[PDB]
Amino acid sequence: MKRTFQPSVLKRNRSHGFRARMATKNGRQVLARRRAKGRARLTVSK
Amino acid sequence: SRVCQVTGKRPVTGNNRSHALNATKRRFLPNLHSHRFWVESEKRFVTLRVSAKGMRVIDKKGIDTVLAELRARGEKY
Amino acid sequence: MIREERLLKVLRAPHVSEKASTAMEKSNTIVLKVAKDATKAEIKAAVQKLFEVEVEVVNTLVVKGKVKRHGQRIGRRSDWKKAYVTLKE
Amino acid sequence: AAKIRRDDEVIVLTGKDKGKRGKVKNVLSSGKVIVEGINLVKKHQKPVPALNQPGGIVEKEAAIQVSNVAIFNAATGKADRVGFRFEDGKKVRFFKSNSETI
Amino acid sequence: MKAKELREKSVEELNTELLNLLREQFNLRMQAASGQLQQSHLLKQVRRDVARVKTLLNEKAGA
RNA sequence: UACGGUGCUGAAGCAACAAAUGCCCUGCUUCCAGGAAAAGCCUCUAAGCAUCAGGUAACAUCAAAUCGUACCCCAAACCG
RNA sequence: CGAAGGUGUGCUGUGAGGCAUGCUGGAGGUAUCAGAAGUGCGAAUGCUGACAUAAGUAACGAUAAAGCGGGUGAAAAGCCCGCUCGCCGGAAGACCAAGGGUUCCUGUCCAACGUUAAUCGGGGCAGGGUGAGUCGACCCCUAAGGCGAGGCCGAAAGGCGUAGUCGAUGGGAAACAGGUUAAUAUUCCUGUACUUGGUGUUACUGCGAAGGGGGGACGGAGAAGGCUAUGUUGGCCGGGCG
RNA sequence: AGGACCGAACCGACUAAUGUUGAAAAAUUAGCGGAUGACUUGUGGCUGGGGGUGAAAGGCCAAUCAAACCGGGAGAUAGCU
RNA sequence: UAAGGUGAUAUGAACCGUUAUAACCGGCGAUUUCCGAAUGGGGAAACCCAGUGUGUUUCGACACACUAUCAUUAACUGAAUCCAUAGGUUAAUGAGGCGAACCGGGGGAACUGAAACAUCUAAGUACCCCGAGGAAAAGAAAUCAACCGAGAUUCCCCCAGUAGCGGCGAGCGAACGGGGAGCAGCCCAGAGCCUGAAUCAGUGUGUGUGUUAGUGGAAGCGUCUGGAAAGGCGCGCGAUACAGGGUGACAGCCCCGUACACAAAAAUGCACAUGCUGUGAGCUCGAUGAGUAGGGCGGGACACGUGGUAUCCUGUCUGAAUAUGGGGGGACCAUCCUCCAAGGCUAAAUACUCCUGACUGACCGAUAGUGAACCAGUACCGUGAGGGAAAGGCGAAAAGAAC
């Protein structure tokens, strides 16, 4: 049965990448929360 | 935005009260109107976005005064 | 110039292996571990400056050091560049 | 600012070898000294092949603390506390309880 | 070398001795990665001497 | 002969017939539901240039950098 | 010349409890009288951890199938080698993209992993291995679409959008055959080639763009012709006569 | 020529059986329907929560849908256990 | 300061110095790859491609500088359109993002209570956005009072759960005035006397006080137990030091410390004096903030829900007087009272802790305390936003079991 995660790096980095966050205001807010909590891998930019 | 360029009338908010005093949030909008004015000092036609109260201010004091005050606010005319 | 400093900086180590010794005896090509950026022309200029030899071409490749485990700590090793230099006869 | 230094001759004060005395070989960063002939520990040395191979039960000189040892005054016949006086421009050690510079 | 001993020096000689230090560095790291150099520590101090020379290259020339 | 293979020597190396969904075919014929865009390519001049500069052909020399390349890929290595 | 804690035993009180003490332990505990409380657990389909029961029970993951000999080792149905058997063969074969990231090869190991054993393995550990002018990326060009100076609009945030600039799933030039290592090969080697730029030299001459024009440039279905990949047979050559 | 016919790939999911602490949180086996189109598919976009999308079932929107998920008001409130 | 070092698991090999440029510490410098506001364009973050000009060319390429967008100024230019603007170029100056809480403004809920619920409550709270500071806001009466008077703002204890508001329900809840903390006044709307006059920002010099390295720092022995004494017994000594931590069991006299006395080459905090740059000081006189106050309609805030409801703010439509004048004294009117709006500046008393050091605890001691005493926002789960654990102890010393 075809599962829900049929992966590809282009859609992954285009949606959840670093620059797609940084180009948006709420993306920069998400990155600031991720840095204030202090996660090691910040986003999937890899 | 929806700002009187001469007077500064920001669209304010308010409560709409019906007959049974049921509150509903609403917005008050000024009487903004784009106008082409004539200045004999520049000897041409300028475009402003004013309200009717602002238009009466243009009527009372000179347009060369309001333009210098607009430049004092650093705005566009 | 820092160009001389660059070509003195590029070459790190001569490489010793079984494929290295085979290619060395066959086609007179040496194998060297070089710096990370370390382009083709800079490698060729550096070997022709420092070993005082002749060079035909240079084949470059970037190899990824394996992701090892020590106890529980995962450690990816370094990322080095290897170049086969084909000397003249 | 350390009271006991390298080529001193000291006595220990707390230990099984109390009252005995020897020279200091080494002062480590931990706050422990090594005194010759005083601390003796039997090491069961597991010999490695690609080096000299003793095997056997070997003897080494373990550590005892700096606080335990004390500098032998070598005139009195027992231990003494030491202080830092200012003799000519280098700051120097001196034995307390009699005006003697080491 | 010792710091004042490089303070008295002159800039073209500083550059030639920089390049001699770098060539010395290269011979040492080549012999080290070949299997030679019982004394490894030489390599380390050679790097320090390079640093010292380059420090004067930003002060004997100009800040 | 490590015993697995290395190194040596190598004759013939044509014809007929069948033949595709492959190439001619980014064709031909027909149908209505009328079937992407810009560049590299070819040509025309404008400002300007006019001994030149360029351009064409010939000849010589040089360069073509950098990144991926191992392995699975209808699976024990991908998603479950 | 032995505290708390642990574990017994014996006295004691109406009860929560207390006291003495054997043994383990190996450095803290605290009278009396007051004070403050995260102050007393059997249940909350309570929470976390350990362990029970069913139980040495079901199951061991396609009904393609195994059998023997020789090897290695402490041990062989499973590993290596050999000989038969059996299964797929428009795949259960050969390559790739996407997606994984060392899983590839060699030596070494069997405590954990393998629904059993394991000397084996995609497991542990170390070492080795990914060679490009021509294949692909990057680069030139654009579709859907994204961003977007000015601009317009919007309480702020921001929304849309012009010039532009990005965006392959499309358009643009170039290399084949053979050989080779345990692991790479259209990349290394042998032989034979081609492309696009740069500079200079020689000879003929108007070049010049972002502007114009052609070209790129395009649907489905049908049908036939020419061919080839490829296969069958005969010849040719080598070996055989069972 | 055909939203033509029979029928593989491909897409589905009508019947029965086996499954039900499975081999699998939707399958396998033997049959079945469409198979030149209102088809199917690879890649890359776009629409979003009282909103999207819908050859329309209140169906799907990351195994969650008469109003997703995540954090926050929040230790909501509970005449109930 | 210094006789010991090469950060730790984590031992080694190789060397450095021991009387002074071995190491460690402290100020100031230099270097500071690539991403990142990311700033030359682009992008799938840590990468791809440039261009302009210089000067090095071994002639194939090098290395460095700059090149975003806006605001403001300045200068060359500069269209339809004569002029002249818009526009364009160049330079200079500034802005940009990150950050825990507090503050001010722009927006702004609902669950809940009312034992239903719509007015109300929750609450201008949560959250979103903008902006700045070490605090921010306010702030110098067109104020309160009562015929007595006070003097800007802010904050705390009262007044006071009081007058009031309110489906007169649930609930919300003042002020006047009293006691404290802290104290501060000004300038423009303008002219003649005046130009370093009473100040404040920014520079140096001078002194002191602190900060960033540090130094000295007291006083004891014997005997039994025991593995070891710091315990017991005995005999002394220090204390402006008996805070604390360690040492083979509990140490004032063993070590580091503490009280105490100091100490800065350099760089800066603070106030103080001494000079530059700007600035006016103080008088005599005239003025005294117009689409504004007030109004009609519709909202909002003051405890106050349109009520009999004064006051302020306003979206809309109007519209005075201008000190012979005008506001306010809780409908409103007359007299009295006090003040002069339509222009601004201002320290302290106040809320806060991302962080730095000391010090405290009838706070916790590994299922507790932060989620994390340990290489924890880690392993793992999710496309994602997000969620998120488990896990301390040998000994005094590894003397970690030779054979």
Residues of E in contact with C8 (CB under 8 A): 19, 22-23, 25-26
In this structure, what are the phi and psi dihedrals at residue C47, rounded to the nearest 5 degrees? -75, -35
Q: Which residues pair with B37 in a beta bridge?
A: B46
Residue E43: CB atoms within 10 A of its CB come to 15
Pick left, alpha or beta for residue C81 (phi over 0 → left; psi -120 to 50 → alpha; otherwise beta).
Answer: beta
Give dist(CA C27, CA C6) in Å, integer: 28
Q: Give me the number of domains chain E comprises.
A: 1
In this structure, what are the phi and psi dihedrals at residue C41, rounded to the nearest 5 degrees? -70, -35
Give dist(CA C44, CA C57) in Å, integer: 8
Q: Give me the number of domains chain A comprises.
A: 1
The closest of B76, B73, B74, B72 to B47, measured between CA atoms, is B76
Query: For residue C33, what is the enclosing H or E element?
Result: strand C29-34
Identify the three-state secondary structure at position D25: strand
Residue C34: CB atoms within 10 A of its CB come to 24
CA of E58 vs chain C CAs: smallest distance (Å): 14
Mutate to test the interface with E, among C3, C10, C50, C78 (most CBs of E within 10 A): C50
Give dist(CA C62, CA C79) in Å, integer: 7
CA of C11 vs chain E CAs: smallest distance (Å): 8
Give dist(CA B43, CA B51) in Å, integer: 23
Please give the residue range of the domain that contains residue A46. 1-46
To one decimal, the resolution in angstroms is: 3.5
Rg (CA), chain C: 15
Calculated CA dihedral for residues D71, D74, D78, D80, nearest 10 degrees = -40
Rg (CA), chain D: 17
The answer to whether the Cβ–Cβ distance between E19 and C9 falls below 8 Å is no
Sign, Cα dihedral of D88, D93, D96, D101: negative
CB within 8 Å of C31: residues ≥ 6 apart: C14, C15, C17, C19, C20, C23, C24, C82, C83, C84, C85
Residue D8: CB atoms within 10 A of its CB come to 20
Tokens of residue A9, six digits: 């790096």
Length of chain E measured in residues = 63
Give dist(CA D28, CA A26) in Å, integer: 56
- Domain positions in chain D are 1-102
Identify the three-state secondary structure at position D100: strand
What is the nearest nucleotide to A6, using C1' and CA? F79
Per-residue flag: D3 CB under 7 A of strand I: yes
Task: Give the residue from chain C lying closest to E32, CA to CA.
Answer: C13
Please give the residue range of the domain that contains residue B30. 1-77
Contact (Cβ atoms closer than 8 angstroms) between residue D76 and residue D100: no
CB within 8 Å of A1: residues ≥ 6 apart: none
- What's B72's domain CATH number? 2.30.170.40
Contact (Cβ atoms closer than 8 angstroms) between residue B51 and residue B34: no
Per-residue flag: D25 CB under 7 A of strand I: no
Give dist(CA C65, CA B23) in Å, integer: 69
Give dist(CA A40, CA C15) in Å, integer: 36
- What's A4's domain CATH number? 1.10.287.3980
Tokens of residue A29, six digits: 């807010």
CA of E31 vs chain C CAs: smallest distance (Å): 9
Identify the three-state secondary structure at position C86: strand
Please give the residue range of the domain that contains residue E9. 2-61
> Residue D6 is which amino acid?
R
